[PDB]
Amino acid sequence: NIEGDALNALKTNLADPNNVLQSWDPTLVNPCTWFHVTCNSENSVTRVDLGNANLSGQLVPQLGQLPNLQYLELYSNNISGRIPFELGNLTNLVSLDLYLNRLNGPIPDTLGKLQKLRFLRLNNNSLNGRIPMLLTTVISLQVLDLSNNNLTGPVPVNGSFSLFTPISFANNPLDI
Ligand SMILES: *[C@@H]1O[C@H](CO)[C@@H](O[C@@H]2O[C@H](CO)[C@@H](O[C@@H]3O[C@H](CO)[C@@H](O)[C@H](O)[C@@H]3O)[C@H](O)[C@H]2NC(C)=O)[C@H](O)[C@H]1NC(C)=O
Ligand SMILES: *[C@@H]1O[C@H](CO)[C@@H](O)[C@H](O)[C@H]1NC(C)=O
Numbered sequence: 001n002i003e004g005d006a007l008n009a010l011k012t013n014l015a016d017p018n019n020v021l022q023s024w025d026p027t028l029v030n031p032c033t034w035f036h037v038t039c040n041s042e043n044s045v046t047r048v049d050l051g052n053a054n055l056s057g058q059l060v061p062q063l064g065q066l067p068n069l070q071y072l073e074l075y076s077n078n079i080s081g082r083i084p085f086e087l088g089n090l091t092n093l094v095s096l097d098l099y100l101n102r103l104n105g106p107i108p109d110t111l112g113k114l115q116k117l118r119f120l121r122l123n124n125n126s127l128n129g130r131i132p133m134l135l136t137t138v139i140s141l142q143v144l145d146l147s148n149n150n151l152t153g154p155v156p157v158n159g160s161f162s163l164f165t166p167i168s169f170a171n172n173p174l175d176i
C-alpha cells in the first residue's frame with residue numbers, strides 16, 4: 001500500500017488533459033493492475049511509462065519511495081518543476097528519460113549515486129546549473145544527452161564521460 005500511496009501522491013500533483021490517470025485508485029491491494037504501470041513477480045512496480053500523454057504539473061518528492069523501480073519514462077509533457085533529490089534512493093534505476101519537458105533547477109549530484117543505470121536523457125529542458133561532478137562515478141552509462149538546456153561550467157571528459165562525444169551536449173550558455 002506504500003507504493004500505491006506514492007503513485008496516488010504523484011497523481012494528485014498532476015493534471016491530466018486526456019484523462020490517462022483515471023484508473024489509479026488506492027483501494028486496491030496492489031498497484032499492479034494500474035494502467036501504464038508494469039509489475040514483476042511478488043507485485044513490485046518496475047516500469048512507469050508515460051510518453052506523449054499531455055501531463056502538466058510538477059514532480060513529487062514521494063516518487064523515490066519505489067525501491068524496485070526501473071525504466072522511468074516521463075517525456076514530452078508540460079511537467080513544470082524541479083528534479084527531486086529522492087531519485088537518489090532508486091538503487092535499481094536503469095533508464096531515466098526526461099526530454100521535451102520544462103523542468104527548472106540544477107541536476108542533483110545525488111543522481112550519480114545510482115550505480116546501475118545505462119540511459120540518462122535530459123533534452124530540450126531549461127535547467128539552471130552546472131553538470132554534476134559525481135556522475136563520472138558510474139561506469140555502466142552508455143548514452144548521455146544533455147542538450148538545448150541552460151548548461152554552464154566545465155565539461156567533464158574524464159572516466160565514463162571521456163567516452164561520449166561532445167556533440168551529444170550542445171546549445172548551452174557555456175560549454176567551453
Ligand atoms: C573527474 O574530474 C572531476 C573534476 O574535474 C572529479 O571531481 C572531483 O574529484 C575530487 C576527488 O578526486 C574532489 O576532491 C574532493 O573535494 C572535496 C570537497 O568537495 C574534499 O573534501 C575532498 O577531500 C577532495 O579534495 C573534487 O571535489 C571533485 N570536484 C571537482 C570540481 O574537482 C572526478 O572525481 C573525476 N572522476 C574520476 C577521476 O573518475
Ligand atoms: C494532447 O496531445 C495531443 C497530441 O497527441 C495534442 O494534439 C492535443 O492538443 C493535446 N491536448 C491538449 C489539451 O493540449
Ligand SMILES: *[C@@H]1O[C@H](CO)[C@@H](O)[C@H](O)[C@H]1NC(C)=O
Pocket residue numbers: 077078
Ligand atoms: C503544453 O505543451 C504544448 C506542447 O505541445 C504547448 O503547445 C502548450 O502551450 C503547453 N501548455 C501550456 C504551456 O499551458
Ligand SMILES: *[C@@H]1O[C@H](CO)[C@@H](O)[C@H](O)[C@H]1NC(C)=O
Pocket residue numbers: 064085086088089110
Ligand atoms: C531518500 O532520499 C533522501 C534525500 O537524500 C534521504 O534524506 C533519505 O534518507 C532517503 N531515504 C532513505 C530510506 O535512505
Ligand SMILES: *[C@@H]1O[C@H](CO)[C@@H](O)[C@H](O)[C@H]1NC(C)=O
Pocket residue numbers: 100123124148
Ligand atoms: C528542441 O527544440 C528545438 C527548437 O528550439 C527543436 O528544433 C528540436 O527538435 C527539439 N529537440 C527535439 C529532440 O525534438
